[PDB]
Amino acid sequence: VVIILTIAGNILVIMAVSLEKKLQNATNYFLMSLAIADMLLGFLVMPVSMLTILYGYRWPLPSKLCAVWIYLDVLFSTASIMHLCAISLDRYVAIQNPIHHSRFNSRTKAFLKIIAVWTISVGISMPIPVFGLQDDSKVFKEGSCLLADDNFVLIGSFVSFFIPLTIMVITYFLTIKSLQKISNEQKACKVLGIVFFLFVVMWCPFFITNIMAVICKESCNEDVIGALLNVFVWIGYLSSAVNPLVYTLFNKTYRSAFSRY
Amino acid sequence: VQLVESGGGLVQPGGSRKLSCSASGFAFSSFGMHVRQAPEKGLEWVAYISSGSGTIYYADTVKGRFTISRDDPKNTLFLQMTSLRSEDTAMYYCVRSIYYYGSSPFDFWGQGTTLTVDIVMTQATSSVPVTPGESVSISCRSSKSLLHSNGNTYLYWFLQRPGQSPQLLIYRMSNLASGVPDRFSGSGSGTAFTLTISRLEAEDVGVYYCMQHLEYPLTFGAGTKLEL
Amino acid sequence: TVSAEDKAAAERSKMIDKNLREDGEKARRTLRLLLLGADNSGKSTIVKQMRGIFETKFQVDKVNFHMFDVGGQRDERRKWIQCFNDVTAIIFVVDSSDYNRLQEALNDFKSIWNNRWLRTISVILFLNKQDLLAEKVLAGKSKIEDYFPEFARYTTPEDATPEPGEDPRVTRAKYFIRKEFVDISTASGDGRHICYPHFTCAVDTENARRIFNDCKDIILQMNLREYNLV
Amino acid sequence: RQEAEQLKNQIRDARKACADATLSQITNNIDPVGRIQMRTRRTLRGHLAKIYAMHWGTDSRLLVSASQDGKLIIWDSYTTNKVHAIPLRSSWVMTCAYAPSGNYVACGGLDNICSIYNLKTREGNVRVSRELAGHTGYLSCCRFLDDNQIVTSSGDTTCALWDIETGQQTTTFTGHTGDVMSLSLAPDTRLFVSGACDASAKLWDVREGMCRQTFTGHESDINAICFFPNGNAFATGSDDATCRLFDLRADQELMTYSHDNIICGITSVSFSKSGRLLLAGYDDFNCNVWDALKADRAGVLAGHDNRVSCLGVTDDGMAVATGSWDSFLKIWN
Amino acid sequence: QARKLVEQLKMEANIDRIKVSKAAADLMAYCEAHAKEDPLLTPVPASENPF
Ligand SMILES: C#CCOc1ccccc1CNCCc1cc(OC)c(N(C)C)cc1OC
């Protein structure tokens, strides 16, 4: 059911930009690209995880395909985090300095920000396909599909998520501070706050459990950590479905487009 | 509008020279620029440079040895020559040309500087006797049809008076260039074309060259001289 | 397929496209304002940085604004105003000193504010001849109650504070006129556009700064609507 | 004043006597046109702001368009190429025109000047040949009689005829109470019609400079006016959202085109080459193809995000160009 | 102004006015005669059109 919503919401978002040409602004191209990453993640990755859940957490799929699956789950997931990080940076720049942002608000730089995000997503996720496909034990370890290089993993989870997280946590808070510096401004503070709170609460638990697992493997119980990771990956996947409904709620035209289709 | 050509002179074979044509009185940036004539033979197209230097073409005879370059703010155009050969001796002309709907390319030609060191277009006659006030017809054949699918046929008639650079009379086989009297008329069939001069008078005597612009390289006919 | 001359024509079209895009990018930098005041407003005097259609360009804090003033057009402005349906803000100027013409100014403001084409654009309202209004109020020969019956039944808001050296009845008159305009501004309730009142004397050091920070506010609100925060 | 009222009643009474039968009754038994479908065969892009005006060339290949960008650019319709890009001094232009010989184009704006540009010159640049000045209001339309003479309607309630070489008004037409919005030259060019916000259209002789006839059947301003190809009739577009056909010889409106669905104003009107189809551009972002003889909508041209300012049918009648405020003008066939 | 209005009304008052039915028939005749000429009324064959 999470997979259905995750696919469907992004599918509606991507068409609504095309079917309704009013949302041809530069921002909604970023928003449709984030929807693309989320829908791709829902289509390619998540039913496989549901299948492993049914089959007992053993990888029925061909052996080397396990290597690319994890790679997809890094690239599509890292892209969404980088999309939201760039959204936070650009929206903070818009709030703090609205006039000067309009001078450089041309779409030509907006496309460079897209190429930057989708380039950094590949740059972060380079090792997993080539290394995992070469050595099964690196990414197929324990008989269940899992990425198992501690040295690479603990830094990779950090740069991919925490570095955007501090950029989000230092920009979002500052965006509220700019609004504070009446009713028009303060209404944005709460709506920004809920969006920040959900994605932090839904993304962060997986990563802290992963880093806690790698560091504390000597001093922790494996089974509880495994169950927690099994559920927290689902919650992180729900993070993908979350954003289209947020789009539906605050914007008039997306709501009309989804009501029609 | 003026195009003044500078540089040239005797060169030892294998040397290098640079010719410069300086444009005054017209917007040099808009005009794509080009053509040499040997001392005792018709014209031959050397090179072409588009507006903004986006596109360059050279004839196969000079490819790899010549270099064409334009300096837009100064308006000057250069042809840098390397490995000069005895065949390269000619009178080098700087020609302007603009390409849009209804344009008249090759309209203005420079004076020329002497240097001393494919669709085949044929003119049936090298010389044609004429009399004043009598109609004269000059014909130029083509190896391939010059009529493109869009309907334009790219034949051009150029006239070179004695002691004067060529000038455009007719562009695209029918249209008459500005500043040219209405006596000249262009009638043309597929692969066969004719220029008819009616009520001929003095100062209309010279060598008439037929050029194709369907595709590069641009080939000139030998041309039919008129003699009174 | 494509002849050589048609290919060169395509190259010319591409060069023209690049020139058009460069000129548009240059044009996007400037923010364009529409200055309108029917008469006795001091529209030439409201902005002092720069001195059929009269165009005034002034720059404050490294941002350049272009102000359009049209004199030829008559009272019926419906047909030429639709051209100025993309301006960032419309600078409206009224003279608070003349009470007889103030109702006409209010009607003009209502017409421009409620114009169908100009629904999106905000308004920067300059109430002019502040010193003249203060002098008339001090003299007391003219009674605002006579021209506006509602002035007698009015209470100045306690939250608002007069500037030092200003009389209380005088401030009451100023805030009455400001509230009278702001009522028409707030009657629609759409929220896409806002009227920002400013009280300006015949000579003021910097109204350009007021226009600048107001334009910052409009662009900020537009960005907040764009990001769906509001 | 009393005498005028009696004469006005005589004109209305005289018109009633002539109107023996309605044109709808006259044309009851003719083949319906049916449902016409026209798909956009092109979309000319390059204008970075709202497009206010566009005019077809006589050859039907080339057109010129005006926009808020402040630049007048000429298109090659068949290949989509841009023949020229002309930078205008004033950003505000409500009108553009193409000379019948194609040598010149005209532009008019809020700067109270009609500017004539010499397209075909030596030195290979578009240069302003003249600036025509003398109007005290914005120029709503300009149309070339020939290469020398141009008629311009203005917001100063007065239309003018100019000799371009002289640069001075040779005739002046003064009968309108409201700003003149539109001007349509007749096929013979000897006379023309103008439209104004007073909700009246008047027939002017070019040489004499007098109003031959006046037609009043519109509740509101008329934005656009177009002569019928025969030259014995014309049609007007109003903000009332009704399009009315008027007859020069009969001196009474023959028919009105209106639908209950559309209350939105008409921005442009044009007549098909046969004259059967009236293409009316609307502020509701959709042009409607009206069967003039029977007044039943036969098709809709719905491909514009913003309002359609302009509409022009080619001389050959093949193509229809519709400009709009979304900065794209689409050629329909 | 009133002297001009009465002058204009008198001039426009007297003109030769054709019956409405005759003008309607003439317009119908023109439209019928030029029906084949118009490409928009009857869609031209695809090869014939330039667009
Ligand atoms: C958005 C979204 C997807 O849902 C989410 C959302 C948040 C957390 C987890 C998930 C579940 N996806 C897991 C993806 C993933 C990302 C990684 O960092 C970028 C890494 N590491 C570098 C260790 C491993 C990994 O798992 C293979």
Short description:
The PDB classes it as membrane protein. The complex is a heteropentamer of chains A (261), B (228), C (230), D (333) and E (51). By secondary structure, chain A is mostly helical.
Which helices and strands, and how do they pair?
The complex is a heteropentamer of chains A (261), B (228), C (230), D (333) and E (51).
Chain B: E1 2-6, E2 9-10, E3 17-24, E4 32-33, E5 36-37, E6 43-44, E7 47-49, E8 56-58, E9 66-71, E10 76-81, E11 90-92, E12 96-97, E13 113-116, E14 121-123, E15 127-129, E16 136-142, E17 155-160, E18 167-171, E19 175-176, E20 184-189, E21 192-197, E22 207-212, E23 224-227
Parallel strand pairs in B: 2-13, 15-23
Antiparallel strand pairs in B: 1-3, 3-10, 4-12, 5-6, 5-11, 7-8, 9-10, 11-13, 14-16, 16-21, 17-18, 17-22, 18-19, 20-21, 22-23
Chain D: H1 2-18, H2 23-26, E1 40-44, E2 51-56, E3 62-67, E4 71-76, E5 82-87, E6 93-98, E7 104-109, E8 113-118, E9 127-133, E10 139-144, E11 149-154, E12 159-163, E13 169-173, E14 180-185, E15 191-196, E16 201-205, E17 211-215, E18 222-227, E19 233-238, E20 243-247, E21 253-257, E22 266-271, E23 277-282, E24 287-291, E25 297-301, E26 312-313, E27 320-322, E28 329-332
Antiparallel strand pairs in D: 1-28, 2-3, 3-4, 4-5, 6-7, 7-8, 8-9, 10-11, 11-12, 12-13, 14-15, 15-16, 16-17, 18-19, 19-20, 20-21, 22-23, 23-24, 24-25, 26-27, 27-28
Chain E: H1 2-13, H2 20-33
Bound molecules: ligand A1AFX.
Residues 41, 70, 73-74, 77-78, 80, 147, 153, 156-157, 160-161, 203, 206, 210, 233, 236-237, 239-240 of chain A line the site of ligand A1AFX.
Binding site for serotonin (chain A): 73, 210
Site (Hydrophobic barrier that decreases the speed of ligand binding and dissociation) (chain A): 147
Motif (NPxxY motif) (chain A): 243-247
How would you characterize this protein structure?
The complex is a heteropentamer of chains A (261), B (228), C (230), D (333) and E (51). With 228 residues, chain B is mostly beta strands. Chain B has no helices and 23 strands. Chain B folds into 2 domains: 2-117, Immunoglobulins (Immunoglobulin-like), CATH 2.60.40.10; 121-226, Sandwich (Immunoglobulin-like), CATH 2.60.40. Chain B has strands at 2-6, 9-10, 17-24, 32-33, 36-37, 43-44, 47-49, 56-58, 66-71, 76-81, 90-92, 96-97, 113-116, 121-123, 127-129, 136-142, 155-160, 167-171, 175-176, 184-189, 192-197, 207-212, 224-227. A 6-stranded mixed sheet of chain B has the order 15-23-22-17-18-19, with no helix packed on it. Chain D has one domain: Methylamine Dehydrogenase, Chain H (7 Propeller), CATH 2.130.10. Chain D has 333 residues and is mainly beta. The termini of chain E are far apart. With 51 residues, chain E is mostly helical. Chain E has one domain (1-51): G Protein Gi Gamma 2. Classes of the chains: A mainly alpha (261), B mainly beta (228), C alpha/beta (230), D mainly beta (333), E mainly alpha (51). At the D-E interface, helix 1 and strand 17 of D face helix 1 and helix 2 of E. The ligand C#CCOc1ccccc1CNCCc1cc(OC)c(N(C)C)cc1OC binds at residues 41, 70, 73-74, 77-78, 80, 147, 153, 156-157, 160-161, 203, 206, 210, 233, 236-237, 239-240 of chain A. Chain A: The chain crosses the membrane at residues 1-15, 30-55, 65-89, 110-133, 151-176, 190-215, 224-249.
